[model samples]
Target: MISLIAALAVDRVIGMENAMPWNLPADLAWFKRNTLNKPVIMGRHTWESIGRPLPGRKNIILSSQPGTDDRVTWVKSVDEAIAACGDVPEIMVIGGGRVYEQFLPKAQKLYLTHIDAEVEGDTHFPDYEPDDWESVFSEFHDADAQNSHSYCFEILERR
Candidate 1:
């Protein structure tokens, strides 16, 4: 199975100046919980933003330049990334907009965190039609000491 995981603003803003616009620990915890031990595919920019390989998951980066780190595998295309994952039951696409656009069509599931506030951003998530997906799970999370904004966590399955 292929899954796309991301946190975007109400306006579909995913990034601003190569960094996430908000700091929500709860969202980060949720992200870690889902992606741990999974094979994750990410674009070069996403890898750079992260600065290091995620500890528990297999890190596969889509980049033209070869990576020197033995901990992370670098592939030139999305196809290569998928191929690198081999027979894994699930592959997680962790993104920086462009990567998400490429895999969204092929993804069987979506794990999305929708932030309540709209903020300035240079990169945005691609739009998807509601008719194409069925919501399998949805829950609201109010802003608190650890989380900055009210958000909703949702799981959508391709219909």
Candidate 2:
């Protein structure tokens, strides 16, 4: 199985400075816990944004161009990442806009966070058609009572 975990604005904006705009502890924790032992595929740019490869999970960084990041298993394509997964039961696709677009349609499930406000972002997630995916599950999280962020942990499955 292939899965994605991400947070987006109403317009599906992903990043402004290649960073998330909201403080979503739940989203981070969810990603850490769920993708820890799995192979996480991402683009070279996204890998660079993290500064280094995350510990525990194997990082498969894809790039059409050459790279020098030894921590990542650099591949040229998403299919190459899948090939590298081999016997792994599931694979997780982490982001950077182009990488997400490459793997989006191939993903069986998507874990999405819908942040309530619009953020100034340069990168955006691709528009998903309602007919292509269905929300099978969702849970809302609140940061705090007084001032907080409103977001949902939603699992969307391809129809």
Candidate 3:
């Protein structure tokens, strides 16, 4: 499966100043659990934002100015990253705005956590038609001391 995974605020904002805009640990844990061991495709900016190649999973970094890294497979395009997944049962496209926008149409599934507030952010999730996907699963959580906002974990499948 080819999937796009992200957490977005009420206004569909995903990033502010090159970092995630929220402090939702449950959502972060949900992301890690679902993407663990999957080949994760992301752009150089996303990789830089993350600071390090995620341990245990294959990190496929896409960049026009790609460089060598023992911890990552540097690729030139999304196609190259997908091709490199080969036999992996599933592949994940984790992002910076550009990468997410580029992979959105091709993604078979989306694992999204919707934060209930609008955060001031520079990066927004690409707009998509509601008819193109259907929510296959969703779990709602109330905000608490551990999580910054109330959120819903939703899994959408292409129709």
Candidate 3 regions exceeding 4 Å error are none
Q: Per-residue lDDT for 70-131 in model 3, tens only?
A: 67899997778899888877899998799999999888999999889878999988998889
- Model 2: runs farther than 4 Å from truth? 145-147
Pick by TM-score: which candidate is best? Answer: 1
Q: Please provide, for model 2 over 65-139, each residue's C-alpha lDDT reduced to its tens digit, 9 standing for 90 to 100.
A: 876867678888777889988788889888878888878888899988888877888998877777989999998
The TM-score that candidate 3 achieves is: 0.96
List per-candidate RMSD values in Å: 0.9, 1.8, 1.0
Locate the minimum summed-lDDT window of 10 residues in model 3.
Answer: 65-74
TM-score of each: 0.97, 0.91, 0.96
Give the candidates in order of lDDT, highest first: 1, 3, 2
Model 1 misplaced stretches (Cα beyond 4 Å): none
Q: What value does the lDDT take at residue 139 in candidate 3?
A: 96
Give the alpha-carbon lDDT of every model.
0.92, 0.82, 0.89
